[model samples]
Target: KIEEGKLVIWINGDKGYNGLAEVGKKFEKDTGIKVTVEHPDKLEEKFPQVAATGDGPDIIFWAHDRFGGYAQSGLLAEITPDKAFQDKLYPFTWDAVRYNGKLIAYPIAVEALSLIYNKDLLPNPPKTWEEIPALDKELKAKGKSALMFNLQEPYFTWPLIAADGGYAFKYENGKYDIKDVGVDNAGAKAGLTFLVDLIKNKHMNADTDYSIAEAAFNKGETAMTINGPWAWSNIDTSKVNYGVTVLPTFKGQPSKPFVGVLSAGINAASPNKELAKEFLENYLLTDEGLEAVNKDKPLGAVALKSYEEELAKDPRIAATMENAQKGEIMPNIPQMSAFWYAVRTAVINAASGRQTVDEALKDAQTRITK
Candidate 1:
């Protein structure tokens, strides 16, 4: 009743997807099935269209954030990881992969934002953001900006948005209540103003985007910035002595970043559902397989709970996981589209002085509500 000798998977291989072929090869050897791994172009743009026709890769490797949209669209197959398998990984990693109480993905890596600072420039990380103003003043005379990051991107700025007890939507009973939008609340205003003042005071560059912020930190010209695991590769390559720590708190509250889980989800229409599930469960997500992938490209925050001891040896992983444990898992619902658009505009308008925090957020609230 099950198809034999075939399994297909698609991934963006250029983005640090290594040691996957070797794992696929082993799966092929064990099951006598041919495994084809394709690095598809325009994967995010094309998966839903191709999968709908039942002619796409059986498995898609991507982030858990998309699970809700795909599963709601009937593009993803539900996956049930047994208790043994579930216990092997950190429980938090599983939060985002579930849509409408159904498990739609097998999480692989956990990612969250943290303070990444050049140790040579900042001997000690700040305990709170209030200290940054003083630090900025001290560092300004030395031709250094105290902090910089992508000011307009919600993904990078959400920590600041949430630091004052803000939220995009309320997550309750395993679901997000999109009607309960909170991006324009009092907390969000406080957080956004923090970022705006840095630029207004001339302590930071309003024009600093992702690359500019990364370049400044990498060149040791800026003392600190915010980033996740993906920033590690370039940071390592740049050879700047740096340290990663939980983001500096704001206004006596935790700085909450969004957590992302890189995951594998099966295509709902795949004829080889059983085979794909077998390969993923028995071959790809195994401890040995995960280790191989890590060897190919060292992971900053591995999702496995048992890896805690090994990862503790790396201070970066330890601190990153600390932030991740305290971070909010991004909402995986389609309603998040409105949140993204609204927040992007609000951040830019506030940062550029085109709108006060209250005005920008009021407009955002109206946009999301409409």
Candidate 2:
């Protein structure tokens, strides 16, 4: 038997905290090994400060994007999962945790923006963007906008440009070419034009920000809104008859939301490296363990292809998995920080009619490149 210390894991967010605690209890009972699961406030800030030294927890569970920088900084241990286990992961999810071709973490869960609709108002979600206008005609009479989403937030609004051909940066084989930005491309322009028209023609309100759209949709005042599964807990309490479905198509192409993956990693300085890896592969990621973790946030599908068919029972999970597989895995590189604000400004400028779509995107491209 290997020498072992308490396998400490610090995670944020309540979505999976209870389930993980339960799973940790089970793991301890099963292996006669001790584990500690914690949810500390300001965890995002606390993790990095402590991670560089021996004071940090043995493992960290955080968003996948953070690990690209984490691993780069030598804060994480490169994990080697068995091929059979690796094959079970969704390729995109796996790619997100892999940095510079080294696997740094286990991709645990995923969140993708999707079309969440009020079933009482919309018997069916629109299959294509072309169909929204017709649905808007009916919705308008009922005092609802056909679609209401956070227009200025790139997390929710990226699909406007991505559904056509726009992207923040050009992604080559396995790396993002930071020098090549694509938000102002012709396809992006077409998509942004359509976005402005929705606001201009009153298909959606220019001012329907996240709080407003979320509250309105929860009240069932809006027929459809583009949001991710993370909104479920709040919406569930509202008792709105909602359905989660794939986003509407634009010109026969699907909208590509930026998929967020939550990942778990072993601390490089942890004393229990083998035990930590054992805890991950044999306990935390097992079907039973993950089901517990994901039950609290089933909106984000558990990130595995082998487990895909089993999760199809819930139409919500099915739709989330469908979208998660095809959606753009949000770039995990540090360069992505430079892209966000500029694009948000672009959308605000265009949607408010302060700048034409052409001018707005061009300005964003300049801001990013400059």
Candidate 3:
């Protein structure tokens, strides 16, 4: 039984929302903290209101990108880790937590993109972007669509960008230099060009919605698709023998997916800072705790060096985890929000054949820069 003076916590109120609820229960039971989670129907809107009033939860399980805005607005607590904890975390995972020399978020789940193929359709996945077009031709000759994906989705473009060594921003001298934006760089242009060419060549359908892709792939109309681990649950796994592998390389590096991680952050305003910190120390940062967290959720743990065992348990996890090792943090800059609409406008225009790839990207760059 929990003690009377135990702390209460407000979290994402989604009932049965995976690991958070389970972990919250464990925390309450073990530390006697009376944890109460409120799942707001619209957290995106409600969280800002709570943060404005300085009455947000004791700890927030938020997207890593959220930290940047919160940090800039002084809405979050400083969560700098000691050297020991710092040493234990993977470099990329640590990088996700650290911003402007302060650790604001504790890494929890790291997500990445990979290539998933129906083994019954294709014996081997392509090794590079160049190979993809040829594979498509071969599959078409066999009267099968070689690959299918939502060409209109930003998530779909990320791997292509990474394959071509294109990056939205670059890191130098220990800080991200967004001034060197590569959205219109030659590599980025090549990546985007490939998409346009694929659409022109009728290798992939630009109009295919996400649902359609899943249905088409499950029906074995298409041999494979480049997506993440989350797709496994929705797709018919038993119908087709499937194989999972990392997104193919372009230059030398595997296509770097923008890894999204959910992290735990201690609220500096919480009355029970000691207890909350203690809770984190007891379970979240420990090896046993990490094992439990990774096992309970579809996510790879922040203690990435130890995630190999979890990966080994499932092929999809294994591929995504391997990709995460080379994954880049999805940019969380507030300016990034502007890029979404801007880039999508270009993507739509290019897909509809209204504008050339370079023109679309140039327009996107101009609009976003403004």
TM-score of each: 0.93, 0.94, 0.90
Global Cα RMSD, each model: 2.2, 2.3, 3.0
Return whichever of 1 and 2 wins on TM-score: 2
- Evaluate model 2: give its TM-score: 0.94
Clashing pairs in 2: none
What TM-score does candidate 1 get on C-alpha atoms?
Answer: 0.93
308-369 per-residue lDDT for model 2 (tens digits) = 56777778878887777667888888878878988888889998889999999999898887
Model 1: ten consecutive residues of lowest lDDT? 1-10
The most accurate candidate by TM-score is 2
Between candidates 1 and 3, which one is better according to lDDT?
Answer: 1
For residues 9-100, write the lDDT of model 3, one tens digit per residue.
44454322445456667877786666665556776456656766766677676678877777676656777567776666667776776667
- Candidate 3: TM-score? 0.90
Which candidate's lDDT is highest? 1
Pairs that collide, model 1: none
* Minimal lDDT window, size 10, model 2: 1-10
How many residue pairs clash in model 3? Answer: 2
lDDT per model vs. reference: 0.82, 0.81, 0.70
